[PDB]
């Protein structure tokens, strides 16, 4: 009959608020041997590894295009990037003229038109003396003025160059993300999850899995895979999507290298501050290249077309992107301190219709040293050379398609790095536990 | 034995007769007691630079707040809110310790009990929170019965 | 080398169970509200401030609900009863319809417009009770 208010404390409910996460450490047997960009020693340890409780009978709406874990992770990867370059050496004594002529010399016969020694008057540690100093420079990192012509660097017009400290590593060590007390991360375990909509299999976790901060355009490297078949995710089905997230099931093992035994010299430009140049290449100068196995790239690219039919009925033409700048036109990645730029015009050549395995696809890769990271202007960065030969061997675990007759065309994507982080952070969000609940029962406070 | 931690060394029969000494230094004399933390704030206002000793006073305050609230919460989940010796309905399982009362209360200190029972307290705390939760449910619908 | 032993109740494990058997696990969520994974077994890093901000936030939210319990008559308790009669314009549902049939997070999305009105009436009847318990001690 008479019902009364009774309040409960410890109630399992949650809103969908957003907050400040923090990182955790993943089994690093270094324990401060070297330092890297990502400052992974500053993360917390955990004596149990992070866990996962299966929650029964609950459904929950996710939305991978309005998840704020991606925008929070994007501001953190830039923040950790700028923390490391700030104590490194400012490199203003290279804004001078660069008088040089191509290189000198069974035959080498390659790299004659993409690389040249350039001599210049540097500063010494006395600010009264000059030193005549040569250095090898890539053709991309030089600009004509007006045989031995006069050159200058790219962003000496627009920026202030700082080189990277060579002890700091660019290796993407995995980072977890953890929630403070009173918060939770809910992940979707359902295999047929298309990015948005509800989810009948949710579980809560202490921390996420290991996300590797791999920076790449047009392709996804060293990521996660798919359980079932190839999932394809766009924003909204309204013919204005323009970006497609393809997630593969089996990888396509890129192997990629630059063959050259180049050296590295140390050149003092002030009180202790040293410029690390490129001395000489020992042996035969070659191009840089990535190999793609033509067998299973043809297999993997075909399965993408099979699942694009379920969204779109038009015929499929994979055409390479055409743009001005070299960053969103090529495939940029990183091998231990070298920034490659690979022409993927042959991986995206063919057209497809509603209806080979001997060779290997070989891609021509350029390489440069002055880098405008994170689509910012004014804060260029000089990557020092690495002695010897380098070799990478990574996995294509997905790819990014930008959309531009009745025959639709998917150019290769690139540009924004937030699309790299929606590939990984799509399957979980942050909630906020509210312990006070209130409900009517038949018990009233027995007074005095 | 009177004095802070002076009963460390006596047996736990006599070390538990003077528990007020510890539950006053750890409830009163931690945050309420000091007013000289806001006498060092204006001296930090005179200098225009954040010093090293200003960071360490954050970390010694946030450790002082959390150490106070993570022992009052745990006494709040149980029925032992504002008191120092409280009894529960949890029967003592002899696989936690088979040891007799005369050996425990009269030939063993509290600091020798820390180094014996510490593997078991996470199991013991689960059974105090569960039986407190079963009690308040039972005294609600009993209340609503009459 | 580890292995899963026996299992007990876990955090949020009664979410979406029901409303009457999810109130038998109130201590399981109330244990995980103050201390998290932040507390384990050199200065001003990006990950250092972001860890310290998570510790100041976790005290401010805990003290918010713990204040609000003591303003009511319900301090140090998990289920307490008030003298505020339930008003059917807040919700008209039956007694066997919210217990044994409804879960929390379905009842949360139902009365979340009325909680600010409900909270005011619990605080008002606590002032009226404590004045009367004072004025009963004058005899």
């Amino acid at each position: 009959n008479n019902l009364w208010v009774t309040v409960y404390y410890g109630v399992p409910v949650w809103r969908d608020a957003e907050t400040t996460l923090f990182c955790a450490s993943d089994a690093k047997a270094y324990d401060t041997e070297v330092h890297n960009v990502w400052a992974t020693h500053a993360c917390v340890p955990t004596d149990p590894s992070p866990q996962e409780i299966h929650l029964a009978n609950v459904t929950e709406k996710f939305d991978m295009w309005k998840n704020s874990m991606v925008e929070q992770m994007h501001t953190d990867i830039i923040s950790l990037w700028d923390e490391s370059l700030k104590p490194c050496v400012k490199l203003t004594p290279l804004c001078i003229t660069l008088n040089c002529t191509n290189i000198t010399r069974n035959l080498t016969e390659e790299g004659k038109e993409e690389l040249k020694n350039c001599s210049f008057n540097a500063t010494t540690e006395l600010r009264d003396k000059i030193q005549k100093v040569h250095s090898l420079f890539y053709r991309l990192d030089l600009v004509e003025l007006n045989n031995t012509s006069m050159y200058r660097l790219i962003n000496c017009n627009t920026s202030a160059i700082t080189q990277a400290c060579p002890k700091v590593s660019f290796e993407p060590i995995p980072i977890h993300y953890c929630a403070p007390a009173g918060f939770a991360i809910l992940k979707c375990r359902e295999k047929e999850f298309n990015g948005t909509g509800p989810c009948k299999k949710v579980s809560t976790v202490q921390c996420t899995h290991g996300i590797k901060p791999v920076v790449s355009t047009q392709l996804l490297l060293n990521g996660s895979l798919a359980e079932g078949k190839v999932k394809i995710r766009c924003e909204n089905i309204s013919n204005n999507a323009k970006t497609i997230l393809v997630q593969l099931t089996t990888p396509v093992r890129i192997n990629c290298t630059r063959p050259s035994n180049n050296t590295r010299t140390s050149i003092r430009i002030g009180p202790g501050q040293s410029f690390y140049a490129t001395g000489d290449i020992i042996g035969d100068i070659r191009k840089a290249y990535c190999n793609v196995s033509e067998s299973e790239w043809k297999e993997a690219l075909g399965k993408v077309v099979e699942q694009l039919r379920n969204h779109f009925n038009k015929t499929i033409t994979f055409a390479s992107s055409s743009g001005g700048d070299l960053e969103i036109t090529t495939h940029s990645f990183n091998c231990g301190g070298e920034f490659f730029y690979c022409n993927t015009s042959s991986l995206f050549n063919s057209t497809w219709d509603g209806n080979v395995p001997n060779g290997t696809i070989t891609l021509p890769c350029r390489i440069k040293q002055i880098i405008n990271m994170w689509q910012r202007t004014g804060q260029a960065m000089y990557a020092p050379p690495i002695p010897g030969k380098i070799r990478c061997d990574s996995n294509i675990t997905g790819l990014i398609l930008i959309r531009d007759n009745e025959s639709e065309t998917f150019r290769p994507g690139g540009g924004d790095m937030r699309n790299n982080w929606r590939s990984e952070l799509y399957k979980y969000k942050v909630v906020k536990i509210d312990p006070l609940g209130v409900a009517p029962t038949g018990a009233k406070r027995r007074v005095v | 034995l009177f004095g802070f931690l002076g009963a460390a060394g006596s047996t736990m029969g006599a070390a538990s007769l003077t528990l007020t000494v510890q539950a006053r230094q750890l409830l009163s004399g931690i945050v309420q007691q000091q007013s000289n933390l806001l006498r060092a704030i204006e001296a930090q206002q005179h200098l225009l630079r954040l010093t090293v000793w200003g960071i360490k006073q954050l970390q010694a305050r946030v450790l002082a707040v959390e150490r106070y609230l993570s022992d009052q919460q745990l006494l709040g989940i149980w029925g032992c809110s504002g008191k120092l010796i409280c009894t529960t309905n949890v029967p003592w399982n002899s696989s936690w310790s088979n040891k007799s009362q005369d050996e425990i209360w009269n030939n063993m200190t509290w600091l020798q009990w820390d180094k014996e029972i510490s593997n078991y307290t996470d199991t013991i705390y689960y059974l105090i929170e569960k039986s407190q939760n079963q009690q308040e449910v039972n005294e609600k619908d009993l209340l609503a019965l009459d | 080398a580890v292995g899963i032993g026996a299992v007990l109740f876990g955090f949020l494990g009664a979410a979406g169970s029901t409303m009457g058997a999810a109130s038998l696990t109130l201590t399981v969520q109330a244990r995980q509200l103050l201390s998290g994974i932040v507390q384990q077994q050199l200065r001003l890093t990006v990950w250092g401030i972001k860890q310290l901000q998570a510790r100041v936030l976790a005290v401010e939210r805990y003290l918010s609900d713990q204040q609000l319990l003591g303003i009511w008559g319900c301090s140090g308790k998990l289920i307490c009863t008030t003298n505020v009669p339930w008003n059917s314009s807040w919700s008209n549902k039956s007694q066997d319809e919210i217990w044994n049939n409804m879960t929390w997070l379905q009842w949360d999305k139902e009365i979340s417009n009325y909680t600010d009105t409900i909270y005011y009436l619990i605080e008002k009847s606590q002032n009226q009770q404590e004045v009367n318990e004072k004025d009963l001690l004058a005899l």
Partner: antibody, heavy 134, light 112 residues
Framework: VQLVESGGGVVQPGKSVRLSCVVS????????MYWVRQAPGKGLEWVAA????????VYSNSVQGRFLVSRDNVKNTLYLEMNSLKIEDTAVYRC????????????????????????????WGQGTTVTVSS | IVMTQTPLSLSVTPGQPASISCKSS???????????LYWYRQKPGQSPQLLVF???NRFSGVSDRFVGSGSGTDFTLRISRVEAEDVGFYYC?????????FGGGTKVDLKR
């Protein structure tokens, strides 16, 4: 310390044996025990592992659903059953002991689970054998 | 977790130190911070015998000639001044996760 075995012999395919491993002067409720397997002219393998709690037992992948490990903390014994014996199990079966005692199960509060801890070896047994034949 | 060793057999001189290395696929650093590498010894027709029960520390009853090293996945075992009690079979064991796998196994011999 001394670790004594028995119970080994010669059987047919499709039979059941019962090995045994009696210990000497342990607490033995603190130490979880093992079973390794060495084929003739081969390297060592791992078969099974029971805890000192006698509650959580694990098996190898090849021997799953066929074996049964138990123990009696009063009698200080190990009781390895076997069922549906194949031909490739002709080897030597050694019981073993971890070099330190695992403690109690450690309750994790966030998920409500108990965890056991496993590590290496001190004392292999004498070494008894089972040879299956026709 | 797989295990591979170099070499499969040694042929050394008494009084000359040698070394045997093990290689793991996954890193064996547990969440305790301590690794899970174990160095064993089986004489022919004999029960096995522990020698080094971490990266570094030596079993109670083993002479100081056996030193251990390594971190991550690369590990070694450097015998100092090989003698007549140092022949037989040497094993690597992980205890990071089940199943508790053993290594391949070396056969240390002299030159008769």
């Amino acid at each position: 310390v001394q670790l004594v075995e028995s119970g080994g012999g010669v059987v047919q395919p499709g039979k059941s044996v019962r090995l045994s491993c009696v210990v000497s002067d342990f607490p033995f409720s603190k130490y979880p025990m093992y079973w390794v397997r060495q084929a003739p002219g081969k390297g060592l393998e791992w078969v099974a592992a029971i805890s000192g709690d006698a509650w959580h037992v694990v098996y190898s992948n090849s021997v799953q659903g066929r074996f049964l490990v138990s123990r009696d903390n009063v009698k200080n014994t190990l009781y390895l059953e076997m069922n549906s014996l194949k031909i490739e199990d002709t080897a030597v079966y050694r019981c073993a002991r971890m070099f330190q005692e695992s403690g109690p199960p450690r309750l994790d509060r966030w998920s409500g689970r108990n965890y056991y801890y496993y590590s290496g070896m001190d004392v292999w047994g004498q070494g008894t054998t089972v040879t299956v034949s026709s | 977790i797989v295990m591979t060793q170099t070499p499969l057999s040694l042929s050394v001189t008494p009084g000359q130190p040698a070394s045997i290395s093990c290689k793991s696929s996954e890193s064996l650093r547990q969440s305790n911070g301590k690794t899970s590498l174990y160095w064993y010894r089986q004489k022919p027709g004999q029960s096995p015998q522990l020698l080094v029960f971490e990266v570094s520390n030596r079993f109670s009853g083993v002479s100081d000639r056996f030193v251990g090293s390594g971190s991550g996945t690369d590990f070694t075992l450097r015998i100092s001044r090989v003698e007549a009690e140092d022949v037989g079979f040497y094993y690597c064991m992980q205890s990071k996760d089940f199943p508790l796998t053993f290594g391949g196994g070396t056969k240390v011999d002299l030159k008769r």
